């Protein structure tokens, strides 16, 4: 078993996380100090966004059982992906602000409505309001 | 669980045993029960590996000779005085 068991498990955790995940916004994660990500990670905690990085191969095995065949093209090199498990949306805006104001990666891709969102069309999810608007 | 392939020895004695051990084999004896003891030969390295696991000396072992299988237990072992090698093994029929 050992670490192969652990990696079999690692896929398992991201698998059922993707079951409850609603909208996914994938970005990169290189060249930035770890302490700087404390702001985004704390934001994800409080805004109900779960972030995790598995290998291109573990990312390959871990999305076939979930409705996430749309974002299969953008899996090249390092793949940071965060998942909004509650209050769907409001994740592209959370990453746009940190991307354009820090001179680094803009965006990789996204995932919503069972279709892939290109890099230049993430503004719809960035401008998408909260779920509580019918009142 | 531990199955050992064996062949019936055709020649016995001091000289034959040394020739066997030079050929990377070693003799063993199967006795017990109402039938006559059977002298067989084992290939050294495979048995040397199985005997490293302690369960070998506790579980019922299976020895296959001429297709026929006999359930035995390791009754006694003769090791080389200073080399990590086996010289002889006693098997009692289970």
């Amino acid at each position: 078993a050992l670490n192969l068991q652990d990696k079999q498990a690692i896929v398992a955790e991201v698998s059922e996380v993707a079951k409850g995940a609603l909208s996914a916004v994938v970005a990169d994660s290189r060249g930035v100090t770890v302490d700087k990500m404390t702001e985004l990670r704390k934001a994800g905690r409080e805004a109900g966004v779960y972030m995790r990085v598995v290998r291109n191969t573990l990312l390959r095995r871990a999305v076939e059982g979930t409705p996430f065949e749309c974002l299969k093209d953008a899996f090249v090199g390092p793949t940071l992906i965060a998942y909004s498990m509650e209050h769907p949306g409001a994740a592209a805006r959370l990453f746009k602000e940190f991307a354009k104001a820090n001179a680094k990666f803009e965006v990789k891709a996204a995932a919503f409505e069972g279709e892939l969102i290109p890099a230049s069309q993430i503004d719809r999810l960035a401008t998408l309001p909260t779920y509580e608007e019918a009142i | 669980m531990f199955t050992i392939n064996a062949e019936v020895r055709k020649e016995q004695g001091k000289g034959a045993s040394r020739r066997l051990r030079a050929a990377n084999k070693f003799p063993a004896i199967i006795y017990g029960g109402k039938e006559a003891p059977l002298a067989i030969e084992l290939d050294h390295d495979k048995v040397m590996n199985m005997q490293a696991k302690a369960e070998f000396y506790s579980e019922v072992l299976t020895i296959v000779v001429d297709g026929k299988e006999i359930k035995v237990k390791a009754q006694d072992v003769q090791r080389h005085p200073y080399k990590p090698k086996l010289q002889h093994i006693d098997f009692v029929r289970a």
């Binding site: - | 302690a54 000396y57 390791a74 006694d76 072992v77 090791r79 080389h80 005085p81 200073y82």
Partner: protein
């Protein structure tokens, strides 16, 4: 050092050292220093190896000495001609045959036992090996 408290006879024939050893298994401890070569083990060498092991483990665990020097070795005084009787006992040795377990250890990790036995083996005139207790 080790030597018999008393003996039936003061002096002993030279004899020979043929054959393999008796006591080839680890009987008391869990690790043992088995002798591969053949020769004599003097009381001084046995004590020298014992100290090296004992300090290596810092007197933790238990140590068994499976050999005892019981054969007296005589030497004539310096610059003395042949004959005029057998020489005087000078020291005691233990005859060692291949396969003899010389030292045993318990209560220490295996790796610590290996270095402890390695340090003692450098004090002995006979090639040795490290052996472990075997079930049956």
């Amino acid at each position: 050092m080790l030597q018999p408290k008393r003996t039936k006879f003061r002096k002993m024939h030279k004899g020979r050292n043929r054959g393999l050893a008796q006591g080839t298994d680890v009987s008391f401890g869990s690790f043992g220093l088995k002798a591969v070569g053949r020769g004599r083990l003097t009381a001084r060498q046995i004590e020298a190896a014992r100290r090296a092991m004992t300090r290596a483990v810092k007197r933790q665990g238990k140590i068994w000495i499976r050999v005892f020097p019981d054969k007296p070795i005589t030497e004539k005084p310096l610059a003395v001609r042949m004959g005029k009787g057998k020489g005087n006992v000078e020291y005691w040795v233990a005859l060692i045959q291949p396969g003899k377990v010389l030292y045993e250890m318990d209560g220490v990790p295996e790796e610590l036992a290996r270095e402890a036995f390695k340090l003692a083996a450098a004090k002995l005139p006979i090639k040795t090996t490290f052996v472990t207790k075997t079930v049956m």
